[PDB]
Write a protein that holds these residues in place. Structure first.
Motif, PDB file in Angstrom:
ATOM      1  N   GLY A  38       0.389   2.936 -16.267  1.00 48.51           N
ATOM      2  CA  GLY A  38       1.840   2.895 -16.061  1.00 48.51           C
ATOM      3  C   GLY A  38       2.489   4.091 -15.376  1.00 48.51           C
ATOM      4  N   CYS A  39       1.745   5.180 -15.167  1.00 48.50           N
ATOM      5  CA  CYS A  39       2.316   6.412 -14.577  1.00 48.50           C
ATOM      6  C   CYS A  39       1.423   6.967 -13.495  1.00 48.50           C
ATOM      7  CB  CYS A  39       2.417   7.524 -15.633  1.00 48.50           C
ATOM      8  SG  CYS A  39       3.316   7.079 -17.106  1.00 48.50           S
ATOM      9  N   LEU A  40       2.050   7.420 -12.413  1.00 44.88           N
ATOM     10  CA  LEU A  40       1.415   8.225 -11.374  1.00 44.88           C
ATOM     11  C   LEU A  40       0.318   7.468 -10.631  1.00 44.88           C
ATOM     12  CD1 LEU A  40       3.116  10.722 -11.704  1.00 44.88           C
ATOM     13  CD2 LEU A  40       1.257  11.746 -13.084  1.00 44.88           C
ATOM     14  N   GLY A  41       0.489   6.165 -10.476  1.00 41.71           N
ATOM     15  CA  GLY A  41      -0.533   5.360  -9.797  1.00 41.71           C
ATOM     16  C   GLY A  41      -0.530   5.604  -8.299  1.00 41.71           C
ATOM     17  N   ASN A  42      -1.528   5.057  -7.609  1.00 36.77           N
ATOM     18  CA  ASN A  42      -1.556   5.149  -6.154  1.00 36.77           C
ATOM     19  C   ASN A  42      -1.075   3.827  -5.528  1.00 36.77           C
ATOM     20  OD1 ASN A  42      -3.855   3.461  -5.914  1.00 36.77           O
ATOM     21  ND2 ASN A  42      -5.272   5.195  -6.104  1.00 36.77           N
ATOM     22  N   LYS A  43      -1.224   3.658  -4.219  1.00 39.89           N
ATOM     23  CA  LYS A  43      -0.633   2.489  -3.553  1.00 39.89           C
ATOM     24  C   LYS A  43      -1.509   1.217  -3.608  1.00 39.89           C
ATOM     25  CE  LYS A  43       2.862   4.646  -0.955  1.00 39.89           C
ATOM     26  NZ  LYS A  43       2.868   6.080  -1.420  1.00 39.89           N
ATOM     27  N   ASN A  44      -2.777   1.365  -3.981  1.00 40.88           N
ATOM     28  CA  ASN A  44      -3.637   0.180  -4.049  1.00 40.88           C
ATOM     29  C   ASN A  44      -3.480  -0.405  -5.444  1.00 40.88           C
ATOM     30  OD1 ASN A  44      -5.548  -1.834  -3.636  1.00 40.88           O
ATOM     31  ND2 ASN A  44      -7.259  -0.433  -3.212  1.00 40.88           N
ATOM     32  N   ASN A  45      -2.348  -1.043  -5.683  1.00 39.55           N
ATOM     33  CA  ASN A  45      -1.935  -1.383  -7.040  1.00 39.55           C
ATOM     34  C   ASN A  45      -0.875  -2.434  -6.866  1.00 39.55           C
ATOM     35  OD1 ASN A  45      -0.302  -1.447  -9.468  1.00 39.55           O
ATOM     36  ND2 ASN A  45      -0.964   0.613 -10.068  1.00 39.55           N
ATOM     37  N   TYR A  46      -1.233  -3.685  -7.163  1.00 41.68           N
ATOM     38  CA  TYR A  46      -0.346  -4.811  -6.913  1.00 41.68           C
ATOM     39  C   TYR A  46      -0.102  -5.600  -8.172  1.00 41.68           C
ATOM     40  CZ  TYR A  46      -1.614  -3.515  -2.160  1.00 41.68           C
ATOM     41  OH  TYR A  46      -1.859  -2.788  -1.027  1.00 41.68           O
ATOM     42  N   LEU A  47       1.144  -6.047  -8.295  1.00 39.98           N
ATOM     43  CA  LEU A  47       1.545  -6.915  -9.393  1.00 39.98           C
ATOM     44  C   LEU A  47       0.818  -8.287  -9.424  1.00 39.98           C
ATOM     45  CD1 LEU A  47       3.788  -9.051 -10.748  1.00 39.98           C
ATOM     46  CD2 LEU A  47       3.350  -6.847 -11.895  1.00 39.98           C
ATOM     47  N   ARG A  48       0.657  -8.907  -8.257  1.00 44.49           N
ATOM     48  CA  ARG A  48      -0.030 -10.192  -8.163  1.00 44.49           C
ATOM     49  C   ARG A  48      -1.166 -10.146  -7.151  1.00 44.49           C
ATOM     50  NH1 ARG A  48       4.848 -13.650 -10.052  1.00 44.49           N
ATOM     51  NH2 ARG A  48       6.243 -12.208  -8.927  1.00 44.49           N
ATOM     52  N   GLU A  49      -2.207 -10.933  -7.400  1.00 46.62           N
ATOM     53  CA  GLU A  49      -3.347 -11.033  -6.486  1.00 46.62           C
ATOM     54  C   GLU A  49      -2.917 -11.451  -5.075  1.00 46.62           C
ATOM     55  OE1 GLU A  49      -6.029 -14.254  -7.254  1.00 46.62           O
ATOM     56  OE2 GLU A  49      -7.767 -13.273  -6.354  1.00 46.62           O
ATOM     57  N   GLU A  50      -1.952 -12.367  -4.973  1.00 40.08           N
ATOM     58  CA  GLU A  50      -1.467 -12.839  -3.649  1.00 40.08           C
ATOM     59  C   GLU A  50      -0.868 -11.741  -2.795  1.00 40.08           C
ATOM     60  OE1 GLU A  50       2.642 -14.627  -5.418  1.00 40.08           O
ATOM     61  OE2 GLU A  50       2.151 -12.777  -4.308  1.00 40.08           O
ATOM     62  N   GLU A  51      -0.175 -10.783  -3.428  1.00 37.11           N
ATOM     63  CA  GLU A  51       0.383  -9.656  -2.682  1.00 37.11           C
ATOM     64  C   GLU A  51      -0.730  -8.750  -2.214  1.00 37.11           C
ATOM     65  OE1 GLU A  51       3.216  -7.004  -4.652  1.00 37.11           O
ATOM     66  OE2 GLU A  51       3.476  -5.810  -2.834  1.00 37.11           O
ATOM     67  N   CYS A  52      -1.732  -8.565  -3.074  1.00 35.57           N
ATOM     68  CA  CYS A  52      -2.843  -7.701  -2.737  1.00 35.57           C
ATOM     69  C   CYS A  52      -3.567  -8.317  -1.527  1.00 35.57           C
ATOM     70  CB  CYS A  52      -3.767  -7.539  -3.957  1.00 35.57           C
ATOM     71  SG  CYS A  52      -5.205  -6.583  -3.661  1.00 35.57           S
ATOM     72  N   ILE A  53      -3.779  -9.624  -1.591  1.00 33.50           N
ATOM     73  CA  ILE A  53      -4.437 -10.404  -0.533  1.00 33.50           C
ATOM     74  C   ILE A  53      -3.677 -10.318   0.788  1.00 33.50           C
ATOM     75  CG2 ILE A  53      -4.740 -12.827   0.220  1.00 33.50           C
ATOM     76  CD1 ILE A  53      -5.985 -13.263  -2.700  1.00 33.50           C
ATOM     77  N   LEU A  54      -2.370 -10.606   0.762  1.00 37.85           N
ATOM     78  CA  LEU A  54      -1.482 -10.420   1.930  1.00 37.85           C
ATOM     79  C   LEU A  54      -1.577  -9.003   2.496  1.00 37.85           C
ATOM     80  CD1 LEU A  54       1.927 -12.120   0.732  1.00 37.85           C
ATOM     81  CD2 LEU A  54       0.676 -12.744   2.849  1.00 37.85           C
ATOM     82  N   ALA A  55      -1.576  -7.997   1.620  1.00 37.84           N
ATOM     83  CA  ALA A  55      -1.531  -6.619   2.102  1.00 37.84           C
ATOM     84  C   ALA A  55      -2.832  -6.192   2.753  1.00 37.84           C
ATOM     85  CB  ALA A  55      -1.150  -5.643   0.966  1.00 37.84           C
ATOM     86  N   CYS A  56      -3.950  -6.681   2.233  1.00 42.01           N
ATOM     87  CA  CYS A  56      -5.217  -6.086   2.593  1.00 42.01           C
ATOM     88  C   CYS A  56      -6.284  -7.000   3.214  1.00 42.01           C
ATOM     89  CB  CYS A  56      -5.800  -5.374   1.362  1.00 42.01           C
ATOM     90  SG  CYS A  56      -4.799  -3.943   0.819  1.00 42.01           S
ATOM     91  N   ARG A  57      -6.048  -8.298   3.324  1.00 46.77           N
ATOM     92  CA  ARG A  57      -7.133  -9.177   3.791  1.00 46.77           C
ATOM     93  C   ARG A  57      -7.739  -8.685   5.101  1.00 46.77           C
ATOM     94  NH1 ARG A  57      -8.468 -13.341   7.151  1.00 46.77           N
ATOM     95  NH2 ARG A  57      -9.928 -14.902   6.314  1.00 46.77           N
ATOM     96  N   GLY A  58      -9.061  -8.576   5.128  1.00 48.09           N
ATOM     97  CA  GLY A  58      -9.785  -8.242   6.348  1.00 48.09           C
ATOM     98  C   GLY A  58     -10.156  -6.778   6.488  1.00 48.09           C
TER      99      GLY A  58
END
Ligand SMILES: N[C@@H](CCC(=O)N[C@@H](CS)C(=O)NCC(=O)O)C(=O)O
Lengths: 60, 241
Positions: A38-58
């Protein structure tokens, strides 16, 4: 952007909440679940799998 | 909780589980009156994706033993009306890590649901005293939660030792509790839950709030907790309790 949002290791951090999150693993090219403290996380940290997928696919 | 054991049913009737919308259990809390809980501020901070400060996004489970049995007899489910984070909370140093949560409707006291006692403002929990931490958090750092509430017996550590073990990280709002030999500790999912201390009448008083740690259960890296006594007046000012 890509270095931070997609290539960074997952970071649980020091706080003791159990926030279920997703991170992109470029060695597997998929998004996986982890538990964020909950504190001091980095940017590779998504609420939902779909956002992670959109952000990083490929990304390698 | 790393290194703990299953709690008895009815053993910690003040322990509460907080679930955020779509996310399941995030943090613990403690019941202190029919209408109020104490928890950790860092559980309830808005971020980029979700409004954790918004009380409508949460459900509190009181009287819960097993997360897989949330409709067991005696489990009480409540919405929140309010979340009051300490005005001095710092989300970067974790100083003043305490929040007050107002229930949308009162808890009904029962064999399974009952408030913890709050210590008076001048009370000191002495170094070395055995106290209890409880929660549904991880049984190992980076590992899986517990369905059944866990309890672990830990010891209050001297503030000076605490500061030296965790340099540039401990403020006077914080207290180290655990074992210098490691092995027993709170962990992710336990934040906001109470330290429970048996006091001079045999009643249990809250000694602090699960806050943070460098990993879990490591040697010379005890859990760090928010102190309760110095917040007694703030709690009274805000809740009447
Ligand atoms: N629940 C009673 C008060 C009795 C009670 O459960 N007190 C709590 C808060 S002081 C307590 O003794 N809890 C700690 C324990 O059971 O050891 C009321 O409605 O006023």
């Amino acid at each position: 952007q890509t270095e931070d949002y997609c290539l960074a290791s997952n970071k649980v951090g020091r706080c003791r909440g159990s926030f279920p999150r997703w991170y992109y693993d470029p060695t597997e090219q998929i998004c996986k679940s982890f538990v964020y403290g909950g504190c001091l996380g980095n940017k590779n940290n998504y609420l939902r799998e779909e956002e992670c997928i959109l952000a990083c696919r490929g990304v390698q | 909780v790393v290194g703990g054991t299953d709690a008895d049913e009815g053993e910690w009737p003040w322990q509460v589980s907080l679930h955020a919308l779509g996310q399941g259990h995030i943090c613990g809390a403690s019941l202190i009156s029919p209408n109020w809980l104490v928890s950790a501020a860092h559980c309830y901070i808005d971020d980029r994706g979700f409004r954790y400060s918004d009380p409508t996004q949460w459900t509190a489970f009181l009287g819960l033993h097993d997360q897989s049995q949330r409709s067991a007899p005696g489990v009480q489910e409540r919405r929140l009306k309010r979340i009051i984070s300490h005005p001095f909370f710092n989300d970067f140093t974790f100083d003043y890590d305490i929040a007050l949560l107002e229930l949308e409707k009162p808890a009904e006291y029962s064999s399974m649901v009952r408030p913890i006692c709050l210590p008076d403002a001048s009370h000191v929990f002495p170094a070395g005293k055995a106290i209890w931490v409880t929660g549904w958090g991880h049984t190992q750092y980076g590992g899986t939660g517990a369905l059944i509430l866990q309890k672990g017996e830990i010891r209050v550590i001297q503030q000076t030792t605490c500061e030296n073990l965790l340099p540039q990280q401990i403020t006077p709002r914080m207290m180290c509790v655990g074992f210098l030999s490691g092995g027993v500790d709170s962990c992710q999912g336990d934040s906001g839950g109470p330290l429970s201390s048996v006091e001079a009448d045999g009643r249990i008083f809250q000694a602090g709030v699960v806050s943070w740690g460098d990993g879990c259960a490591q040697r010379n890296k005890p859990g760090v907790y928010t102190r309760l006594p110095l917040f007694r007046d703030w709690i009274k000012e805000n809740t009447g309790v």
